[PDB]
Every structure is written in C-alpha cells, then in structure tokens.
Amino acid sequence: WKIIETFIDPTQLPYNEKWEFPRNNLQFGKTLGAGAFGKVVEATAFGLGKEDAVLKVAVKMLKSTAHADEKEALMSELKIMSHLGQHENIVNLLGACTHGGPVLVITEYCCYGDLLNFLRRKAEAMLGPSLGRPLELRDLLHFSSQVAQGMAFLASKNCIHRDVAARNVLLTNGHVAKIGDFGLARDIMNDSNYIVKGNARLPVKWMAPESIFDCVYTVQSDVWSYGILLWEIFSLGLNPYPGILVNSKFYKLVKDGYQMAQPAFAPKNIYSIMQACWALEPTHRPTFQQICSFLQEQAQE
Ligand SMILES: COc1cc(C2CN(C(=O)c3cc(COC[C@@H](O)CO)ccn3)C2)ccc1OCc1ccc(C2CC2)cc1
Ligand SMILES: [Mg+2]
Ligand SMILES: [Mg+2]
C-alpha cells in the first residue's frame, strides 16, 4: 500500500500515543495467521478504549525471526492505520503497545475470518446434503458493496492498497466485510498466489497490466484488482485464471485484452462491471464511488 501527497514516506508519519495500551492487559489465545516474520494472534484486552471494554481483539506482532526492517514495516502499518482513520468496511485499529517490549498492533477481531475461505467453506456446506442458511445472490452483492465502500474510503484518503483480493477481506459480526492487509502475517513465500517477479513476490493474477509492465500503482489499478475480487466472489472462491501458468504468454495475453469468462453465479450486469474494471486504459475503468453507487442499488432489491 502507498498514500499520495509522489508518495508519502510512512516511516516519517507520527505515532500518536492516544492508541497506547498496556501489554500486560492482553491475554493471548490462538494464532490466527502467520508469515515468515510476523503473525496475528487472538487476545482478550482488558479495559480497551473509552468504554474500558473487555473484548476479543486481534494482535499483529513480529516473530523471533524478524529483524529491524520488519519492525519498521509493522510500525509503518500502525502509523498508516491511525492516519487513514476509521470506517465500517476496513479492519480498524483499536490500540498498540510500543513501550516496554515488542511492538503489538491491536485490531478488531473478525469472527468469520477471511472472505475467500468463507466462500469456499460455505459452497461445500451448501453441497453437503446431496453429498446457518445457504448463501443467496443478495449476500454476494452485499459483500461486494461492502468491500467497494471500504475501497472508496481508502481511495478518498489517497491510499492505494496494492493487494486487493478476497484473501485480504475479513467478515465480522453480521457477515459484514472489511478490507485490510495481512501483510507480514501472511506466508507469501510458500503461497501459490504470489509469483516471483524480479526481487518481489507479487499477486500477479490480481494485478493491472500497467502494474506488472511499468510498476505503476494507482487507485485505478486497485479497481482492476477489485474486478478480480468480484470474480472470486461470484465464483464462490475459484482461483483466477484457473489452470493457467504465469509466464510470458500469460503476461502478453492480459496486456492484449484477455479476460476471464463470466463466473457461474454472476448476473450479467455484475460480469459487465468486472469487465469494466478490466479496461486496458486505466482512466476508462469505473471509480470506486461508481461501483458503490451501482452495487448499493443492486444489493438493495
Ligand atoms: C486483513 O487485514 C488485517 C488483518 C488483521 C487481523 C487478522 N484478523 C482477524 O480478525 C482474523 C480472524 C480470523 C478468525 O477466523 C475464524 C474462522 O476461521 C472460523 O470459521 C482469522 C484470521 N484473522 C484481524 C489485522 C490488520 C489487517 O490489516 C490492517 C490494515 C488495514 C488497512 C490498510 C490499508 C491499505 C493501507 C492496511 C492494513
Ligand atoms: Mg466507563
Ligand atoms: Mg481506561
């Protein structure tokens, strides 16, 4: 992710101690996710926030394999979450522990986990009787609308996400979707969705051609990625470009205008908005506000 002012150096942002929470008032539980150098662990926080709440939270932290560069990355994430401010459809910051030990970033806990796994498990549950309630089209529209609203919020704050994907969306109480980024708490090195391109491990099947070829990241490239996310939703969590190897031919195909076919559960106008997100000319793609407008109408019927 990057925020525009040229981009802002997140290392230079301020940490405001309004967020500080005593680490001794966390009681940790199970690990929710881990990468090479970082992890997210559930905890109970005692006396968190204005209301001195006692609640289940998620805590992002470094593993013993981390060094100073990963400390700095986690601090950058903390500062950017504080800078962007709060929204219903993002993963919100609740606190941090920066004094007296390793940096802990306390966020909302989202009881249904990531959207991709949720859709995959739900599909299996829905096939189970032949082989709570089932998903309906309206649910898929609500998830889509919710992520779009989170993205419109981020875009309104000059934030470019750069890893929009169902795997970075969580579902909380009421199955409300929230966009975030697992970041260091994701094991990208062993994840088939991140491909070696140069020095970096990149989610190439989600990426706009201008991001792949010219390393340009804009809000318009996030819209491309959102189109791919829509395809994930309306396929109930198929892998994009299924069965296709990422090589120079895939790279050329997408630059030449190849698009995935309509997923099984997309109405025609949802497939059309996917296609619109995949316009080769970035300025021809919809904005997140246009997507929100459209999806709010579709979801409220
Ligand atoms: C996904 O992103 C984040 C996640 C987090 C953590 C991970 N959490 C969870 O709540 C959670 C819950 C479950 C439960 O699963 C139970 C099921 O398996 C049972 O069926 C599984 C995995 N994770 C929040 C923090 C910051 C996160 O991102 C912070 C962030 C927010 C905005 C930005 C913008 C782009 C700059 C960057 C980073
Ligand atoms: Mg009180
Ligand atoms: Mg208090």
mmCIF file of C-alpha atoms and ligand atoms in Angstrom:
data_model
loop_
_atom_site.group_PDB
_atom_site.id
_atom_site.type_symbol
_atom_site.label_atom_id
_atom_site.label_comp_id
_atom_site.label_asym_id
_atom_site.label_seq_id
_atom_site.Cartn_x
_atom_site.Cartn_y
_atom_site.Cartn_z
ATOM 1 C CA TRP A 1 0.000 0.000 0.000
ATOM 2 C CA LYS A 2 1.065 3.665 -0.631
ATOM 3 C CA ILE A 3 -0.565 7.062 0.254
ATOM 4 C CA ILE A 4 -0.211 10.071 -2.234
ATOM 5 C CA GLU A 5 0.586 13.673 -1.089
ATOM 6 C CA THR A 6 4.653 11.366 -5.320
ATOM 7 C CA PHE A 7 4.051 9.046 -2.294
ATOM 8 C CA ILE A 8 4.279 9.747 1.479
ATOM 9 C CA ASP A 9 7.158 8.068 3.381
ATOM 10 C CA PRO A 10 5.201 6.186 6.127
ATOM 11 C CA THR A 11 8.332 5.980 8.306
ATOM 12 C CA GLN A 12 8.045 9.759 8.747
ATOM 13 C CA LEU A 13 4.439 9.679 9.937
ATOM 14 C CA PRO A 14 3.861 10.262 13.690
ATOM 15 C CA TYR A 15 2.753 7.603 16.169
ATOM 16 C CA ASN A 16 0.169 9.220 18.453
ATOM 17 C CA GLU A 17 0.177 7.760 21.977
ATOM 18 C CA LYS A 18 -3.627 8.133 22.157
ATOM 19 C CA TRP A 19 -3.518 4.496 20.925
ATOM 20 C CA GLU A 20 -1.185 3.165 23.618
ATOM 21 C CA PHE A 21 -2.435 0.221 25.658
ATOM 22 C CA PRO A 22 -0.611 -1.721 28.410
ATOM 23 C CA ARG A 23 0.683 -5.039 27.059
ATOM 24 C CA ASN A 24 0.093 -6.651 30.476
ATOM 25 C CA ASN A 25 -3.655 -6.240 29.906
ATOM 26 C CA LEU A 26 -3.670 -8.583 26.922
ATOM 27 C CA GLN A 27 -4.263 -12.296 27.436
ATOM 28 C CA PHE A 28 -3.326 -14.163 24.291
ATOM 29 C CA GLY A 29 -5.104 -17.108 22.664
ATOM 30 C CA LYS A 30 -4.736 -18.947 19.380
ATOM 31 C CA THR A 31 -2.704 -17.823 16.390
ATOM 32 C CA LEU A 32 -4.961 -16.683 13.533
ATOM 33 C CA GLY A 33 -2.336 -16.331 10.796
ATOM 34 C CA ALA A 34 1.446 -16.325 10.334
ATOM 35 C CA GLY A 35 4.078 -15.475 7.771
ATOM 36 C CA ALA A 36 7.857 -15.797 7.916
ATOM 37 C CA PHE A 37 8.399 -12.803 10.227
ATOM 38 C CA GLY A 38 5.005 -11.846 11.685
ATOM 39 C CA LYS A 39 1.738 -13.239 12.965
ATOM 40 C CA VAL A 40 -1.713 -12.336 14.176
ATOM 41 C CA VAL A 41 -2.892 -13.803 17.485
ATOM 42 C CA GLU A 42 -6.280 -13.501 19.157
ATOM 43 C CA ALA A 43 -6.345 -11.931 22.631
ATOM 44 C CA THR A 44 -8.658 -10.605 25.270
ATOM 45 C CA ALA A 45 -7.997 -6.965 26.034
ATOM 46 C CA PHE A 46 -8.981 -5.716 29.483
ATOM 47 C CA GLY A 47 -10.112 -2.111 29.676
ATOM 48 C CA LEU A 48 -9.650 -1.168 25.994
ATOM 49 C CA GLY A 49 -10.841 2.256 24.749
ATOM 50 C CA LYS A 50 -13.165 4.963 26.066
ATOM 51 C CA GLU A 51 -15.667 2.426 27.471
ATOM 52 C CA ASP A 52 -12.980 0.259 29.143
ATOM 53 C CA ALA A 53 -14.290 -2.674 27.149
ATOM 54 C CA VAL A 54 -13.234 -6.297 27.840
ATOM 55 C CA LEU A 55 -13.322 -7.954 24.395
ATOM 56 C CA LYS A 56 -11.733 -10.342 21.911
ATOM 57 C CA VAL A 57 -9.220 -8.492 19.669
ATOM 58 C CA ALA A 58 -6.563 -9.460 17.146
ATOM 59 C CA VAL A 59 -2.940 -8.607 17.750
ATOM 60 C CA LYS A 60 -0.389 -8.284 14.969
ATOM 61 C CA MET A 61 3.205 -8.802 16.096
ATOM 62 C CA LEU A 62 6.644 -9.953 14.920
ATOM 63 C CA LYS A 63 8.063 -13.478 15.340
ATOM 64 C CA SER A 64 11.558 -14.150 16.761
ATOM 65 C CA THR A 65 12.785 -14.496 13.136
ATOM 66 C CA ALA A 66 12.115 -10.767 12.491
ATOM 67 C CA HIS A 67 14.755 -8.002 12.336
ATOM 68 C CA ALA A 68 14.724 -4.188 12.334
ATOM 69 C CA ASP A 69 13.323 -3.893 8.771
ATOM 70 C CA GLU A 70 10.216 -5.933 9.771
ATOM 71 C CA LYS A 71 9.889 -3.726 12.991
ATOM 72 C CA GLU A 72 9.871 -0.749 10.843
ATOM 73 C CA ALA A 73 7.287 -2.246 8.480
ATOM 74 C CA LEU A 74 4.966 -3.095 11.397
ATOM 75 C CA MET A 75 5.340 0.427 12.814
ATOM 76 C CA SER A 76 4.532 1.796 9.322
ATOM 77 C CA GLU A 77 1.366 -0.268 9.232
ATOM 78 C CA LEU A 78 0.367 1.045 12.672
ATOM 79 C CA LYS A 79 1.007 4.677 11.637
ATOM 80 C CA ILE A 80 -0.891 4.315 8.377
ATOM 81 C CA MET A 81 -3.951 2.727 10.094
ATOM 82 C CA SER A 82 -4.003 5.696 12.541
ATOM 83 C CA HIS A 83 -3.535 8.161 9.641
ATOM 84 C CA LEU A 84 -6.316 6.768 7.415
ATOM 85 C CA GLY A 85 -8.952 6.915 10.139
ATOM 86 C CA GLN A 86 -11.847 4.554 10.811
ATOM 87 C CA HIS A 87 -14.537 3.019 8.559
ATOM 88 C CA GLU A 88 -17.118 0.221 8.930
ATOM 89 C CA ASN A 89 -15.664 -1.692 5.940
ATOM 90 C CA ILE A 90 -11.953 -1.647 6.851
ATOM 91 C CA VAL A 91 -10.102 -3.569 9.520
ATOM 92 C CA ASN A 92 -9.817 -0.905 12.237
ATOM 93 C CA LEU A 93 -7.050 -0.133 14.683
ATOM 94 C CA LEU A 94 -8.022 -0.377 18.365
ATOM 95 C CA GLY A 95 -4.692 0.168 20.174
ATOM 96 C CA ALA A 96 -0.976 -0.524 20.198
ATOM 97 C CA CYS A 97 1.798 -1.483 22.596
ATOM 98 C CA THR A 98 5.050 0.302 21.748
ATOM 99 C CA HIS A 99 6.627 0.792 25.210
ATOM 100 C CA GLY A 100 8.144 -1.896 27.409
ATOM 101 C CA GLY A 101 8.582 -4.643 24.821
ATOM 102 C CA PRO A 102 7.963 -5.676 21.193
ATOM 103 C CA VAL A 103 5.505 -3.682 19.100
ATOM 104 C CA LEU A 104 1.938 -5.056 19.236
ATOM 105 C CA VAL A 105 -0.765 -3.763 16.911
ATOM 106 C CA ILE A 106 -4.281 -4.321 18.268
ATOM 107 C CA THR A 107 -7.084 -4.505 15.725
ATOM 108 C CA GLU A 108 -10.684 -5.596 15.513
ATOM 109 C CA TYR A 109 -11.245 -9.336 15.550
ATOM 110 C CA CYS A 110 -13.480 -10.567 12.723
ATOM 111 C CA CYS A 111 -15.166 -13.754 13.861
ATOM 112 C CA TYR A 112 -15.818 -15.327 10.412
ATOM 113 C CA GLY A 113 -12.237 -14.948 9.112
ATOM 114 C CA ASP A 114 -11.199 -14.252 5.533
ATOM 115 C CA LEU A 115 -13.809 -13.960 2.796
ATOM 116 C CA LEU A 116 -12.098 -16.439 0.452
ATOM 117 C CA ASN A 117 -12.083 -19.316 2.919
ATOM 118 C CA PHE A 118 -15.600 -18.341 3.985
ATOM 119 C CA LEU A 119 -16.958 -18.626 0.446
ATOM 120 C CA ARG A 120 -15.132 -21.896 -0.174
ATOM 121 C CA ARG A 121 -16.381 -23.494 3.080
ATOM 122 C CA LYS A 122 -19.956 -22.217 2.537
ATOM 123 C CA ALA A 123 -20.039 -23.674 -1.004
ATOM 124 C CA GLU A 124 -19.033 -27.042 0.452
ATOM 125 C CA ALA A 125 -21.667 -26.753 3.202
ATOM 126 C CA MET A 126 -24.298 -25.909 0.596
ATOM 127 C CA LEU A 127 -23.462 -29.051 -1.425
ATOM 128 C CA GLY A 128 -23.330 -31.189 1.734
ATOM 129 C CA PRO A 129 -26.971 -32.516 1.949
ATOM 130 C CA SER A 130 -26.834 -34.111 -1.521
ATOM 131 C CA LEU A 131 -23.252 -35.265 -0.913
ATOM 132 C CA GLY A 132 -26.658 -21.262 9.085
ATOM 133 C CA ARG A 133 -28.605 -20.666 5.884
ATOM 134 C CA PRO A 134 -27.329 -21.010 2.281
ATOM 135 C CA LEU A 135 -25.833 -18.003 0.503
ATOM 136 C CA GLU A 136 -28.129 -16.077 -1.798
ATOM 137 C CA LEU A 137 -27.218 -13.659 -4.598
ATOM 138 C CA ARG A 138 -28.089 -10.792 -2.311
ATOM 139 C CA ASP A 139 -25.359 -11.884 0.117
ATOM 140 C CA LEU A 140 -22.727 -11.824 -2.647
ATOM 141 C CA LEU A 141 -23.944 -8.355 -3.634
ATOM 142 C CA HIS A 142 -23.673 -7.148 -0.017
ATOM 143 C CA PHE A 143 -20.092 -8.470 0.342
ATOM 144 C CA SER A 144 -19.209 -6.767 -2.952
ATOM 145 C CA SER A 145 -20.849 -3.489 -1.927
ATOM 146 C CA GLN A 146 -19.155 -3.531 1.496
ATOM 147 C CA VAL A 147 -15.672 -4.063 0.049
ATOM 148 C CA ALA A 148 -16.335 -1.312 -2.516
ATOM 149 C CA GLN A 149 -17.283 1.096 0.282
ATOM 150 C CA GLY A 150 -14.084 0.274 2.179
ATOM 151 C CA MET A 151 -12.120 0.837 -1.008
ATOM 152 C CA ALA A 152 -13.927 4.120 -1.742
ATOM 153 C CA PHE A 153 -12.979 5.224 1.778
ATOM 154 C CA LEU A 154 -9.311 4.294 1.264
ATOM 155 C CA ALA A 155 -9.283 5.994 -2.124
ATOM 156 C CA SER A 156 -10.799 9.133 -0.527
ATOM 157 C CA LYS A 157 -7.720 9.204 1.755
ATOM 158 C CA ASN A 158 -5.340 8.947 -1.248
ATOM 159 C CA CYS A 159 -4.488 5.338 -0.255
ATOM 160 C CA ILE A 160 -3.530 2.782 -2.889
ATOM 161 C CA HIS A 161 -3.959 -0.680 -1.380
ATOM 162 C CA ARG A 162 -1.970 -2.793 -3.970
ATOM 163 C CA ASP A 163 -3.212 -6.220 -2.691
ATOM 164 C CA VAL A 164 -6.987 -6.150 -3.130
ATOM 165 C CA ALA A 165 -8.078 -9.801 -3.053
ATOM 166 C CA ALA A 166 -10.685 -11.885 -1.191
ATOM 167 C CA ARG A 167 -7.875 -13.251 0.987
ATOM 168 C CA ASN A 168 -7.411 -9.724 2.437
ATOM 169 C CA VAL A 169 -11.114 -9.252 3.196
ATOM 170 C CA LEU A 170 -12.478 -10.335 6.593
ATOM 171 C CA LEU A 171 -16.052 -10.955 7.714
ATOM 172 C CA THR A 172 -17.101 -9.803 11.154
ATOM 173 C CA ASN A 173 -20.335 -9.959 13.111
ATOM 174 C CA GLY A 174 -23.371 -9.872 10.848
ATOM 175 C CA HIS A 175 -21.126 -11.112 7.997
ATOM 176 C CA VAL A 176 -20.009 -7.515 7.353
ATOM 177 C CA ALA A 177 -16.966 -7.349 5.037
ATOM 178 C CA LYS A 178 -13.824 -5.405 5.895
ATOM 179 C CA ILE A 179 -10.769 -4.813 3.690
ATOM 180 C CA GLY A 180 -7.328 -4.918 5.253
ATOM 181 C CA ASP A 181 -3.916 -6.444 4.589
ATOM 182 C CA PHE A 182 -2.434 -9.413 6.428
ATOM 183 C CA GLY A 183 0.965 -8.092 5.361
ATOM 184 C CA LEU A 184 3.719 -9.743 7.420
ATOM 185 C CA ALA A 185 1.215 -12.180 8.912
ATOM 186 C CA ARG A 186 0.801 -13.790 5.504
ATOM 187 C CA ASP A 187 3.315 -16.587 4.386
ATOM 188 C CA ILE A 188 3.840 -15.169 0.892
ATOM 189 C CA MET A 189 6.998 -17.265 0.284
ATOM 190 C CA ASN A 190 5.014 -20.531 0.138
ATOM 191 C CA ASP A 191 1.778 -19.102 -1.312
ATOM 192 C CA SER A 192 0.951 -20.064 -4.927
ATOM 193 C CA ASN A 193 -0.947 -16.751 -5.366
ATOM 194 C CA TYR A 194 2.287 -14.729 -5.089
ATOM 195 C CA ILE A 195 4.687 -15.174 -8.008
ATOM 196 C CA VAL A 196 8.381 -14.316 -8.254
ATOM 197 C CA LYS A 197 8.725 -11.293 -10.481
ATOM 198 C CA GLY A 198 12.140 -9.688 -10.019
ATOM 199 C CA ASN A 199 13.110 -9.259 -6.368
ATOM 200 C CA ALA A 200 9.495 -9.297 -5.267
ATOM 201 C CA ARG A 201 6.674 -11.836 -4.661
ATOM 202 C CA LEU A 202 3.658 -10.263 -6.312
ATOM 203 C CA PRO A 203 -0.050 -11.198 -6.640
ATOM 204 C CA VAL A 204 0.324 -11.007 -10.495
ATOM 205 C CA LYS A 205 -3.159 -12.644 -11.233
ATOM 206 C CA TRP A 206 -4.787 -9.747 -9.363
ATOM 207 C CA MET A 207 -2.615 -7.023 -10.874
ATOM 208 C CA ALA A 208 -3.405 -4.484 -13.627
ATOM 209 C CA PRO A 209 -1.162 -4.772 -16.738
ATOM 210 C CA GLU A 210 0.367 -1.284 -16.049
ATOM 211 C CA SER A 211 1.345 -2.521 -12.550
ATOM 212 C CA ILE A 212 3.049 -5.636 -13.992
ATOM 213 C CA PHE A 213 4.801 -3.946 -17.000
ATOM 214 C CA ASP A 214 5.510 -0.377 -15.652
ATOM 215 C CA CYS A 215 5.412 -0.942 -11.818
ATOM 216 C CA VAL A 216 2.727 1.804 -11.696
ATOM 217 C CA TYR A 217 0.219 1.532 -8.821
ATOM 218 C CA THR A 218 -2.791 3.873 -8.721
ATOM 219 C CA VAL A 219 -6.356 3.834 -7.428
ATOM 220 C CA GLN A 220 -7.234 2.736 -10.982
ATOM 221 C CA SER A 221 -5.016 -0.329 -10.616
ATOM 222 C CA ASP A 222 -6.817 -1.130 -7.356
ATOM 223 C CA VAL A 223 -10.055 -1.062 -9.379
ATOM 224 C CA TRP A 224 -8.617 -3.719 -11.706
ATOM 225 C CA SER A 225 -7.823 -5.848 -8.665
ATOM 226 C CA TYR A 226 -11.308 -5.244 -7.322
ATOM 227 C CA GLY A 227 -12.684 -6.650 -10.565
ATOM 228 C CA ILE A 228 -10.674 -9.811 -9.932
ATOM 229 C CA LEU A 229 -12.059 -9.851 -6.335
ATOM 230 C CA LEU A 230 -15.582 -9.642 -7.807
ATOM 231 C CA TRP A 231 -14.754 -12.696 -9.947
ATOM 232 C CA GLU A 232 -13.612 -14.512 -6.806
ATOM 233 C CA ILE A 233 -16.882 -13.615 -5.039
ATOM 234 C CA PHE A 234 -19.228 -14.628 -7.860
ATOM 235 C CA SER A 235 -17.353 -17.893 -8.434
ATOM 236 C CA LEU A 236 -17.512 -18.672 -4.666
ATOM 237 C CA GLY A 237 -13.727 -18.575 -4.448
ATOM 238 C CA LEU A 238 -12.236 -20.113 -7.560
ATOM 239 C CA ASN A 239 -8.627 -19.210 -8.287
ATOM 240 C CA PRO A 240 -8.366 -16.525 -11.012
ATOM 241 C CA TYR A 241 -7.287 -17.645 -14.495
ATOM 242 C CA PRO A 242 -7.762 -21.235 -13.292
ATOM 243 C CA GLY A 243 -5.250 -23.720 -14.615
ATOM 244 C CA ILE A 244 -3.191 -21.049 -16.407
ATOM 245 C CA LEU A 245 0.544 -20.834 -15.674
ATOM 246 C CA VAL A 246 2.013 -17.360 -15.074
ATOM 247 C CA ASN A 247 4.635 -16.976 -17.805
ATOM 248 C CA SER A 248 5.400 -14.535 -20.636
ATOM 249 C CA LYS A 249 2.425 -15.824 -22.627
ATOM 250 C CA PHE A 250 0.010 -15.062 -19.690
ATOM 251 C CA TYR A 251 1.639 -11.623 -19.356
ATOM 252 C CA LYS A 252 1.111 -10.929 -23.106
ATOM 253 C CA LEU A 253 -2.442 -12.346 -23.090
ATOM 254 C CA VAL A 254 -3.585 -9.978 -20.369
ATOM 255 C CA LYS A 255 -1.835 -6.951 -21.948
ATOM 256 C CA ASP A 256 -3.614 -7.907 -25.235
ATOM 257 C CA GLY A 257 -7.017 -7.827 -23.556
ATOM 258 C CA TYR A 258 -7.710 -11.416 -22.422
ATOM 259 C CA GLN A 259 -10.377 -11.550 -19.722
ATOM 260 C CA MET A 260 -11.738 -14.347 -17.574
ATOM 261 C CA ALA A 261 -15.153 -15.729 -18.601
ATOM 262 C CA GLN A 262 -18.379 -14.993 -16.674
ATOM 263 C CA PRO A 263 -18.355 -16.843 -13.324
ATOM 264 C CA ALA A 264 -21.132 -19.255 -12.579
ATOM 265 C CA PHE A 265 -23.050 -17.017 -10.133
ATOM 266 C CA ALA A 266 -22.548 -13.538 -11.618
ATOM 267 C CA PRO A 267 -25.637 -11.854 -13.102
ATOM 268 C CA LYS A 268 -24.868 -10.311 -16.479
ATOM 269 C CA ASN A 269 -24.544 -6.761 -15.136
ATOM 270 C CA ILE A 270 -22.055 -7.905 -12.424
ATOM 271 C CA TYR A 271 -19.932 -9.572 -15.104
ATOM 272 C CA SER A 272 -20.178 -6.315 -17.088
ATOM 273 C CA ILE A 273 -18.843 -4.286 -14.186
ATOM 274 C CA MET A 274 -15.953 -6.809 -13.840
ATOM 275 C CA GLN A 275 -15.204 -6.277 -17.493
ATOM 276 C CA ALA A 276 -15.288 -2.512 -16.959
ATOM 277 C CA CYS A 277 -12.736 -2.828 -14.109
ATOM 278 C CA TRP A 278 -10.517 -4.662 -16.623
ATOM 279 C CA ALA A 279 -10.402 -1.869 -19.181
ATOM 280 C CA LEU A 280 -6.860 -1.664 -20.507
ATOM 281 C CA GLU A 281 -6.997 2.133 -20.363
ATOM 282 C CA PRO A 282 -6.952 2.944 -16.608
ATOM 283 C CA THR A 283 -8.991 6.171 -16.903
ATOM 284 C CA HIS A 284 -11.805 4.194 -18.556
ATOM 285 C CA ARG A 285 -12.338 1.955 -15.516
ATOM 286 C CA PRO A 286 -15.095 2.878 -13.049
ATOM 287 C CA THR A 287 -14.224 4.705 -9.887
ATOM 288 C CA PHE A 288 -14.894 3.095 -6.523
ATOM 289 C CA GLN A 289 -17.711 5.591 -5.967
ATOM 290 C CA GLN A 290 -19.361 4.498 -9.240
ATOM 291 C CA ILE A 291 -19.023 0.866 -8.174
ATOM 292 C CA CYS A 292 -20.552 1.676 -4.773
ATOM 293 C CA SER A 293 -23.486 3.530 -6.312
ATOM 294 C CA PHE A 294 -24.204 0.651 -8.676
ATOM 295 C CA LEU A 295 -23.814 -2.136 -6.097
ATOM 296 C CA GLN A 296 -25.861 -0.356 -3.400
ATOM 297 C CA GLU A 297 -28.772 -0.268 -5.850
ATOM 298 C CA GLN A 298 -28.276 -3.911 -6.852
ATOM 299 C CA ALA A 299 -27.917 -5.125 -3.233
ATOM 300 C CA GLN A 300 -30.971 -3.168 -2.055
ATOM 301 C CA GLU A 301 -33.650 -5.031 -4.011
HETATM 302 C C1 LIG B 1 -6.837 -8.489 6.727
HETATM 303 O O1 LIG B 1 -6.081 -7.407 7.192
HETATM 304 C C2 LIG B 1 -5.760 -7.297 8.523
HETATM 305 C C3 LIG B 1 -5.991 -8.305 9.451
HETATM 306 C C4 LIG B 1 -5.649 -8.189 10.792
HETATM 307 C C5 LIG B 1 -6.013 -9.300 11.743
HETATM 308 C C6 LIG B 1 -6.387 -10.752 11.321
HETATM 309 N N1 LIG B 1 -7.714 -10.534 11.931
HETATM 310 C C7 LIG B 1 -8.774 -11.292 12.257
HETATM 311 O O2 LIG B 1 -9.738 -10.804 12.808
HETATM 312 C C8 LIG B 1 -8.819 -12.748 11.852
HETATM 313 C C9 LIG B 1 -9.827 -13.562 12.337
HETATM 314 C C10 LIG B 1 -9.867 -14.894 11.967
HETATM 315 C C11 LIG B 1 -10.971 -15.768 12.518
HETATM 316 O O3 LIG B 1 -11.279 -16.808 11.628
HETATM 317 C C12 LIG B 1 -12.204 -17.709 12.203
HETATM 318 C C13 LIG B 1 -12.696 -18.686 11.137
HETATM 319 O O4 LIG B 1 -11.627 -19.422 10.629
HETATM 320 C C14 LIG B 1 -13.746 -19.637 11.733
HETATM 321 O O5 LIG B 1 -14.519 -20.138 10.667
HETATM 322 C C15 LIG B 1 -8.898 -15.384 11.106
HETATM 323 C C16 LIG B 1 -7.919 -14.525 10.643
HETATM 324 N N2 LIG B 1 -7.871 -13.236 11.006
HETATM 325 C C17 LIG B 1 -7.515 -9.102 12.072
HETATM 326 C C18 LIG B 1 -5.087 -7.009 11.231
HETATM 327 C C19 LIG B 1 -4.838 -5.987 10.320
HETATM 328 C C20 LIG B 1 -5.174 -6.118 8.968
HETATM 329 O O6 LIG B 1 -4.913 -5.065 8.148
HETATM 330 C C21 LIG B 1 -4.706 -3.762 8.654
HETATM 331 C C22 LIG B 1 -4.710 -2.778 7.503
HETATM 332 C C23 LIG B 1 -5.862 -2.044 7.245
HETATM 333 C C24 LIG B 1 -5.879 -1.143 6.197
HETATM 334 C C25 LIG B 1 -4.729 -0.985 5.407
HETATM 335 C C26 LIG B 1 -4.745 -0.032 4.247
HETATM 336 C C27 LIG B 1 -4.158 -0.450 2.915
HETATM 337 C C28 LIG B 1 -3.437 0.570 3.782
HETATM 338 C C29 LIG B 1 -3.613 -1.736 5.645
HETATM 339 C C30 LIG B 1 -3.596 -2.637 6.698
HETATM 340 MG MG MG B 2 -16.868 3.564 31.660
HETATM 341 MG MG MG B 3 -9.405 3.191 30.602
#
